[PDB]
Structure formats: structure tokens, C-alpha cells
Write a protein that holds these residues in place. Structure first.
Motif, PDB file in Angstrom:
ATOM      1  N   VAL A   9       0.869  -1.119   0.132  1.00  0.00           N
ATOM      2  CA  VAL A   9       0.001   0.033   0.130  1.00  0.00           C
ATOM      3  C   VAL A   9       1.003   1.436   0.016  1.00  0.00           C
ATOM      4  O   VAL A   9       1.891   1.153   0.440  1.00  0.00           O
ATOM      5  CB  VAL A   9      -1.016   0.007   1.184  1.00  0.00           C
ATOM      6  N   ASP A  33      -6.590  -7.779  -5.420  1.00  0.00           N
ATOM      7  CA  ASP A  33      -6.576  -7.429  -4.219  1.00  0.00           C
ATOM      8  C   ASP A  33      -7.515  -8.209  -3.122  1.00  0.00           C
ATOM      9  O   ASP A  33      -8.860  -8.190  -3.474  1.00  0.00           O
ATOM     10  CB  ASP A  33      -7.065  -5.795  -4.136  1.00  0.00           C
ATOM     11  N   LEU A  41      -8.381   1.343  -0.590  1.00  0.00           N
ATOM     12  CA  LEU A  41      -7.290   1.085  -1.556  1.00  0.00           C
ATOM     13  C   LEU A  41      -7.662   1.276  -3.162  1.00  0.00           C
ATOM     14  O   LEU A  41      -8.803   0.950  -3.481  1.00  0.00           O
ATOM     15  CB  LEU A  41      -7.079  -0.334  -1.257  1.00  0.00           C
ATOM     16  N   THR A  43      -5.488   1.635  -7.141  1.00  0.00           N
ATOM     17  CA  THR A  43      -4.388   1.784  -7.809  1.00  0.00           C
ATOM     18  C   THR A  43      -4.473   2.387  -9.130  1.00  0.00           C
ATOM     19  O   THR A  43      -5.493   2.287  -9.748  1.00  0.00           O
ATOM     20  CB  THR A  43      -3.769   0.420  -8.053  1.00  0.00           C
ATOM     21  N   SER A  79      -0.268   2.440  -5.909  1.00  0.00           N
ATOM     22  CA  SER A  79      -1.258   2.425  -4.782  1.00  0.00           C
ATOM     23  C   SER A  79      -1.600   3.376  -3.804  1.00  0.00           C
ATOM     24  O   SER A  79      -0.581   4.133  -3.282  1.00  0.00           O
ATOM     25  CB  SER A  79      -1.375   1.018  -4.288  1.00  0.00           C
ATOM     26  N   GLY A  81      -3.911   4.047  -0.058  1.00  0.00           N
ATOM     27  CA  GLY A  81      -4.796   3.329   0.937  1.00  0.00           C
ATOM     28  C   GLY A  81      -4.461   3.980   2.366  1.00  0.00           C
ATOM     29  O   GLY A  81      -3.314   4.427   2.430  1.00  0.00           O
ATOM     30  N   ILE A  85      -2.904  -2.926   5.144  1.00  0.00           N
ATOM     31  CA  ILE A  85      -3.558  -3.539   3.992  1.00  0.00           C
ATOM     32  C   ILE A  85      -2.426  -4.629   3.387  1.00  0.00           C
ATOM     33  O   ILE A  85      -1.358  -4.521   3.297  1.00  0.00           O
ATOM     34  CB  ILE A  85      -4.156  -2.681   2.869  1.00  0.00           C
TER      35      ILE A  85
END
Length: 97
Positions: A9, A33, A41, A43, A79, A81, A85
Motif C-alpha cells: 500500500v 486485491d 485502496l 491503484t 497504490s 490506501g 492492507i
């Protein structure tokens, strides 16, 4: 070419190619994911040449294809978030004509 990698992340990983020929480049990618988008999250995929021109971009990328002609370029996945994660798994396949 084919690459598999983990994307933590809030990180970025890029593949840079410097082939000094004019090319048709095609690609296919899949971002997986396990958390179902936990922590918001998301990307982004961005392909740029050496002068920063955008050859292709996808916000909120998941699974898809791209194509562009050239001569140096970079394919980047990033990414964003919040919180802890698990790493995402990304596959990228490209071919060069």
C-alpha cells in the motif's frame, strides 16, 4: 515479457524500457486485491515517455489492456490506501512490435 510482483500500500513500482527503435507496444495487466478495497485502496497505472508525456493512464485500474507507439518509456503502478492492507499482486504482460 511478463512480470509478477507485489505492490505494498502507498508504494510505486515501475518498469523502464529504453529500446531506441520505433515500436508498437501492447500490454495486459491484472491487479488483484484480497481485501476488496479495504482502507479505500485504489491503484493508478501511468505510462510516460522520457519527457513526461502520458502515453496511457488509468485511474482506479483493475484489469485491462493498453497500447501505444513510440522512444523510451516507463510503466508505473502506484497504490493509495489507509491502514494495514496486505500487498496486492500485479501481473503485467507486454509485447513489442
Amino acid at each position: 515479457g511478463s512480470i509478477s510482483f507485489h505492490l505494498p500500500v502507498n508504494s510505486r513500482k515501475c518498469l523502464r524500457e529504453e529500446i531506441h527503435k520505433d515500436l508498437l507496444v501492447t500490454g495486459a495487466y491484472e491487479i488483484t486485491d484480497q481485501s476488496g478495497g479495504a482502507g479505500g485502496l485504489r491503484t493508478h497505472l501511468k505510462i510516460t515517455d522520457s519527457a513526461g508525456h502520458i502515453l496511457y493512464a488509468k485511474e482506479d485500474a483493475t484489469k485491462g489492456k493498453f497500447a501505444f507507439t513510440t522512444d523510451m518509456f516507463e510503466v508505473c503502478f502506484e497504490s493509495k490506501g489507509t491502514g494495514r492492507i496486505p500487498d496486492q499482486l500485479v501481473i503485467l504482460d507486454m509485447k513489442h512490435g
